């Protein structure tokens, strides 16, 4: 399953959209300047617990 | 499919681990203080394109 | 009760406003670039206490 | 409806928990150092749209 | 005493200025994009002490 | 009216509390490490309007 | 000695320059958007020591 | 007039205090870890104007 | 060529070091808390040019 | 092997691209404003382990 | 040896370039908006060691 | 002239100090956790001009 497009680095948005929609017809393509947000790899086995000063769960745990 | 544990907000790490491993035996549980990183919802239909000043792809596009 | 519009990811502002105002006629719609602020889920059961070096309440506690 | 506790500024965590649980027996109390995260007022009428370079919706819109 | 204008969320700058100057004729109105600075509630009873590694006062204490 | 204590820079928390409570018996004293939050002068004549991409009011305007 | 111009809040750059140069003919006036940098009060009696993990001086101490 | 102590880089806090108080008996010495705040050179001729979206003065101008 | 160890997520530092040194005997292993720095994928084909206001090269370009 | 172009500091993007593509015909050139992201030297011998509160591996270790 | 140009504060880029190139004919002049990056004084005697959780060297030490 | 110690990555502070002081007897060694500050290469030919909204010099230009 193809989930990354390293061949598109350096290419135009127009070329990137054409290639991505060929491989992933349902793609919802979002165009952002570098450094807008810090993306993160999704790990379906991982569950992060964010805890407070007393080691209680402070945010809703979710897979990723 | 259960991917979030809102019932665990306010509970201890020990209780959270017990509940999560019951629902998701393979979970790799990570314990972090609030505010360490900014997590983000994973959207399997979305592909973000991060672009440079000339609208060329600057980072490897990936699903999420 | 509908409080999220995942179907609007990738659509235009114009389409998003039309859909949101159909579902939520009172919506006050605000349009911001990605990464402007870090939004956070509202949890009506939760009360965060922000404390100082001596574990005294430093900000007004509020629900959320 | 009471949703804020300005009278607790300057008091201990122990006193704050006692008062909050009297007013809101279901409260899930989280204790964090000042400056950990930037909280934000929840506005049930507001819907923020976070948009990309081409004014398309980049994140799931939600009430708040 | 009116110190907040929740009714103005979603309205134009022009409408906001008209309403604010009606309620507060002396208002010095400043127009900034979201996320420029992090504003903070002013609490006339509170005095924050900002301390150094040795718990000495490092900045001039002021009310707020 | 005294609202600042420049004479306390360099002194201990204990000395600072004694002086502040003499001048302001109602003070709610909060002790934080330098750099925890960015405080800001309160200006009772000023009203900041935080606006979105379309120059609409995005946050509740308040005095300060 | 006048070192601050609170009367200029809300006025134009043009008006501000005229007033400041009347009071301080040598002023080197710099025009920046809000939030560009975090300015800090200069205290001629204060000397900050910035220290490393072993409590050694890590940066050149200077008055301010 | 001596306003900087480059000879103290690498020395202990104890040695630094002894030297600084010899040169500047009135010094109010503050000890902070590196990176706590971003200090800035004070320029007595300079006046920064921080402006809003409409080029109006948004903060009190001050010398420095 | 193995350059990533996804199987180590959730395991101890001790187990991780043992596995990494088996696969990569020369590894120089560094142990940091999450969120200390933002790491980035190295792309041997890519050359980033960081430019100033006038589109001149402002930093030494390097592969990566 | 040439992996850095210190001779290009101060030159135009156009000149930089010409020189880089002469030395590295496969270069994928990305043009970004200064300060967009914090780049980091790639060290093929190094493996960073990012750990959680309990010293467990929190992110996939990778060479660099 | 002249390494700083305090006389140029408040002057135009054009005037600054003329003066700097007179004093330093080899200068590679870079023009950036305030707040883009945090510059730092170079100290030829200093060597910073950046260490990990176990006090091992985590980055290549360099003079400065 | 040796100005960097890549051979010390992964070694202890004690070993690093011994090696650095052998090569550079005058070194003023500072020990900081990773991510405390963002260091930057010093370029003796470069002069950065930091400019304000009107392209006037806003900070003292210096070599580096």
Author numbering:
A (entry chain A), B (entry chain A), C (entry chain A), D (entry chain A), E (entry chain A), F (entry chain A), ...: 3 to 66
Structure paper excerpt:
To identify possible spatial arrangements for assembly, we analyzed the crystal lattice of CI2 by X-ray crystallography. CI2 crystallizes in the hexagonal space group P622 in all the conditions we attempted that rendered crystals. On the lattice, the protein forms double hexameric rings in which the two rings are packed head to head and rotated by ~30°. This spatial arrangement is strongly predefined by symmetry, and thus we identify the toroidal D6 particles of the crystal as the target for engineering a CI2 assembly. An unexpected discovery was that we observed domain swapping at certain crystallization conditions. Indeed, crystals obtained using salt as primary precipitant follow the standard arrangement of early structural work on CI241 (left), whereas crystals grown with PEG feature domain-swapped dimers arranged in the same lattice structure and group symmetry (right). In domain-swapped crystals, equivalent monomers on the two rings exchange their C-terminal segments (residues 39–66) to form dimers that covalently link the rings via the active loops (right). Domain swapping does not affect the monomer–monomer interface of each ring, and thus is unable to self-sufficiently promote assembly in solution, but it does demonstrate an inherent tendency of the C terminus of CI2 to unwind, and the robustness of the toroidal D6 packing symmetry for this protein.
